[PDB]
Enzyme design. Sequence first.
Site, short mmCIF file in Angstrom:
data_model
loop_
_atom_site.label_atom_id
_atom_site.label_comp_id
_atom_site.label_asym_id
_atom_site.label_seq_id
_atom_site.Cartn_x
_atom_site.Cartn_y
_atom_site.Cartn_z
N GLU A 110 -3.09 13.56 1.02
CA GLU A 110 -3.89 12.97 1.80
C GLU A 110 -4.93 14.48 2.38
O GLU A 110 -6.16 14.54 2.05
CB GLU A 110 -4.19 12.42 2.93
CG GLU A 110 -3.03 11.05 1.74
CD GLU A 110 -4.16 9.26 2.39
OE1 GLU A 110 -3.63 9.45 4.16
OE2 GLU A 110 -4.41 8.34 1.89
N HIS A 154 2.84 10.24 7.39
CA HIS A 154 3.04 10.36 8.29
C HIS A 154 3.17 9.91 9.48
O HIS A 154 3.72 8.73 9.12
CB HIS A 154 1.66 9.83 8.34
CG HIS A 154 0.55 9.79 6.85
ND1 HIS A 154 -0.96 9.58 6.60
CD2 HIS A 154 0.16 11.80 6.90
CE1 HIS A 154 -1.87 10.35 6.24
NE2 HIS A 154 -1.02 11.50 5.95
N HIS A 190 0.50 -1.29 0.21
CA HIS A 190 -0.03 0.04 0.16
C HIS A 190 0.62 1.25 0.71
O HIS A 190 0.64 2.36 -0.45
CB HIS A 190 -0.68 -0.22 1.44
CG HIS A 190 -1.50 -1.02 2.03
ND1 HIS A 190 -2.72 -1.80 0.24
CD2 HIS A 190 -1.62 -2.34 2.50
CE1 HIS A 190 -3.06 -2.49 0.95
NE2 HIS A 190 -2.28 -3.06 2.32
ZN ZN Z 1 -0.44 7.84 6.37
#
Ligand code: ZN
Length: 258
Positions: free
Chosen positions: A105, A118, A63
């Site tokens: 995002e 992140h 991912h």
């Molecule tokens: Zn993330």
Amino acid sequence: AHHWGYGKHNGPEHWHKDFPIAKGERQSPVDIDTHTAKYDPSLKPLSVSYDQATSLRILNNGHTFNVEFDDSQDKAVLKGGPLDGTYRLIQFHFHWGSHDGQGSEHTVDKKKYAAELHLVHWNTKYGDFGKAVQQPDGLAVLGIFLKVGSALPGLQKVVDVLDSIKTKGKSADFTNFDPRGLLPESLDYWTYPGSLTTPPLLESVTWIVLKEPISVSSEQVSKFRKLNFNGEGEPEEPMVDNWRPTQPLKNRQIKASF
Ligand SMILES: [Zn+2]
Ligand SMILES: [Zn+2]
């Protein structure tokens, strides 16, 4: 065979089917409207204690790529700001686009950045990440925008190893990486309660999103795009556009530290 992803039949618009919390009240990411995001002078200063951060591995999970940290003790730690207690850094990863004009995002006044970093932390009120991830006060994710411009030296050690984890399932040794090289100079931030931006989409995240982006080069980000979602022996799918569109804010308020 079927597994969640970022494609047409396993992507963000489809997740609600296998993970109905996707349509919850505290979903992430959100747009940051700098006109309504009101300042909070009660917010304590953010404390980022990454001096003894101890990286372990860099891996492709199908991912994104994750840099894992040793969270056995209070080594790299996030406190203060909106947080009650101490949150231990467990791993960091990125989200990025197929081209420099999308990839983040969160958005800021609907502006998309080229990528988002992140840094995932979990609350030591709980025994480990597996317990914390299920609880509304379980996690704290520090979100950092990347904008294409100057090459970031603190990212180079990461970029030079991405060719050894091209496909899902590969995990390489990766010690002595300093995450402080991935921080901007200013720690002014927005904060709101939210969720994981991927399945299982659990609403357990205090989001802390810095205003100041870091600058990366187009070449560094284009190396991110050389990763593949698929495992060895599966049809190639470039790892690009692994970001979730922004979600309704609902009854939540985004607070500014500045
Ligand atoms: Zn993330
Ligand atoms: Zn599904």
